[PDB]
Amino acid sequence: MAMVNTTTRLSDDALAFLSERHLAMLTTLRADNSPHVVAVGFTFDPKTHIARVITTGGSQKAVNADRSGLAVLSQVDGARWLSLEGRAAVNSDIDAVRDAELRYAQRYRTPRPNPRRVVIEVQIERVLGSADLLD
Amino acid sequence: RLSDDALAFLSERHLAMLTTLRADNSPHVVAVGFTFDPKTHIARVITTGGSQKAVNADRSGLAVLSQVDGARWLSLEGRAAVNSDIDAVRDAELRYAQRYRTPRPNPRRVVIEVQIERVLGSADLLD
Numbered sequence: 039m040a041m042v043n044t045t046t047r048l049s050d051d052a053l054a055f056l057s058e059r060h061l062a063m064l065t066t067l068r069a070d071n072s073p074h075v076v077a078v079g080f081t082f083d084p085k086t087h088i089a090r091v092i093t094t095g096g097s098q099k100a101v102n103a104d105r106s107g108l109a110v111l112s113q114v115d116g117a118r119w120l121s122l123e124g125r126a127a128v129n130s131d132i133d134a135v136r137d138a139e140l141r142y143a144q145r146y147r148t149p150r151p152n153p154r155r156v157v158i159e160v161q162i163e164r165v166l167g168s169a170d171l172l173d
Numbered sequence: 174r175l176s177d178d179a180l181a182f183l184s185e186r187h188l189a190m191l192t193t194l195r196a197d198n199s200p201h202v203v204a205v206g207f208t209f210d211p212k213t214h215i216a217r218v219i220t221t222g223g224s225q226k227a228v229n230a231d232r233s234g235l236a237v238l239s240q241v242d243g244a245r246w247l248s249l250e251g252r253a254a255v256n257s258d259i260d261a262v263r264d265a266e267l268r269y270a271q272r273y274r275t276p277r278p279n280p281r282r283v284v285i286e287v288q289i290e291r292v293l294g295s296a297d298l299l300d
């Protein structure tokens with residue numbers, strides 16, 4: 039396990055795994071507090087500890103992120119895995135959307151246009167994962 | 174709601190995430206294998222008894238099992254309980270081996286059994 043805050047740095051191996059191309063699951067909570075888990079891409083900025091998901095505004099995952107205010111982003115590749123937990127909010131500012139799209143293209147590829155795109159921003163505070171990555 | 178293509182995806186070898194809730198209701202999400210029986214709609218995770226994921230399954234009673242392979246993905250949601258019966262554990266180990274490979278021996282192994290009530294996933298897998 040590791041805490042994440044202004045004084046922390048994830049291990050080099052964990053950061054590498056986060057920069058490599060991997061798909062993930064986004065977990066949020068529904069209004070009844072049941073977990074909502076859906077496949078996404080995401081990006082993680084080690085300088086700010088902000089994880090981003092681009093998605094459609096008003097989509098279920100966006101509604102939950104906004105309403106309950108928390109999210110987890112989780113990826114696995116065999117023995118390596120990580121879950122990044124934190125506080126979440128939805129940003130619909132078009133310049134923030136563009137910044138998110140540019141970040142997404144680095145990890146994945148240029149995304150298809152989406153006039154209703156928003157960003158879920160997650161301020162990562164705790165990480166779970168495989169023992170070799172943590173540190 | 175699960176099509177033939179969804180059932181095939183569930184039998185193919187893929188790793189997954191198990192989501193449970195901690196005591197404070199925050200989601201605990203960890204990499205696992207799982208098996209799914211289409212006849213009974215039971216999904217199973219084998220794990221160590223007293224492990225965090227097992228504690229949460231027992232305490233909060235809810236789980237999700239979620240897998241992705243590119244454009245294909247599914248999340249199977251339902252009510253969860255922990256079964257430590259030695260014949261249930263052996264049966265869950267054999268099922269795990271069908272999908273993955275024979276698991277390491279572990280006398281403290283238990284089964285998180287999830288009765289799947291709701292499925293989310295890619296549109297092309299759902300009916």
Ligand SMILES: C[C@H](OP(=O)(O)OC[C@@H](O)[C@@H](O)[C@@H](O)Cn1c2nc(=O)[nH]c(=O)c-2cc2ccc(O)cc21)C(=O)N[C@@H](CCC(=O)N[C@@H](CCC(=O)N[C@@H](CCC(=O)O)C(=O)O)C(=O)O)C(=O)O
Nearest residue numbers: 039116117118119166203204205206219220224225226228
């Ligand atoms: C992440 C960890 O959860 P866990 O201990 O349930 O999970 C351990 C492993 O099962 C995972 O690493 C799992 O991902 C490994 N794994 C799998 N595990 C499987 O089981 N089955 C599979 O099929 C499987 C397949 C698989 C495939 C690929 C792969 O990459 C990994 C795979 C955790 O929360 N860790 C916490 C600590 C948890 C903790 O505190 N544990 C306590 C026991 C629980 C407990 O006492 N909890 C207290 C709280 C204690 C506290 O405050 O610290 C409570 O709930 O009241 C202890 O070790 O003694 C942390 O990072 O800090």
Ligand SMILES: C[C@H](OP(=O)(O)OC[C@@H](O)[C@@H](O)[C@@H](O)Cn1c2nc(=O)[nH]c(=O)c-2cc2ccc(O)cc21)C(=O)N[C@@H](CCC(=O)N[C@@H](CCC(=O)N[C@@H](CCC(=O)O)C(=O)O)C(=O)O)C(=O)O
Nearest residue numbers: 076077078079092093094096097098099243244245246293
């Ligand atoms: C699964 C779905 O949630 P979603 O609509 O938030 O997600 C749609 C897609 O984004 C996902 O399929 C996602 O996995 C697609 N996807 C990606 N999506 C991305 O967005 N970003 C990515 O980077 C991404 C990458 C990616 C990579 C690989 C891959 O295979 C897939 C990828 C869901 O809950 N569906 C429910 C229905 C939900 C619902 O009711 N939606 C409401 C709107 C939300 C709402 O207002 N909800 C109400 C409740 C509605 C009710 O009562 O039912 C509320 O919470 O108050 C509606 O359509 O009207 C179901 O099937 O049953």
Ligand SMILES: [Cl-]
Nearest residue numbers: 092093094152
């Ligand atoms: Cl999008």
Ligand SMILES: [Cl-]
Nearest residue numbers: 219220221282
């Ligand atoms: Cl185990």
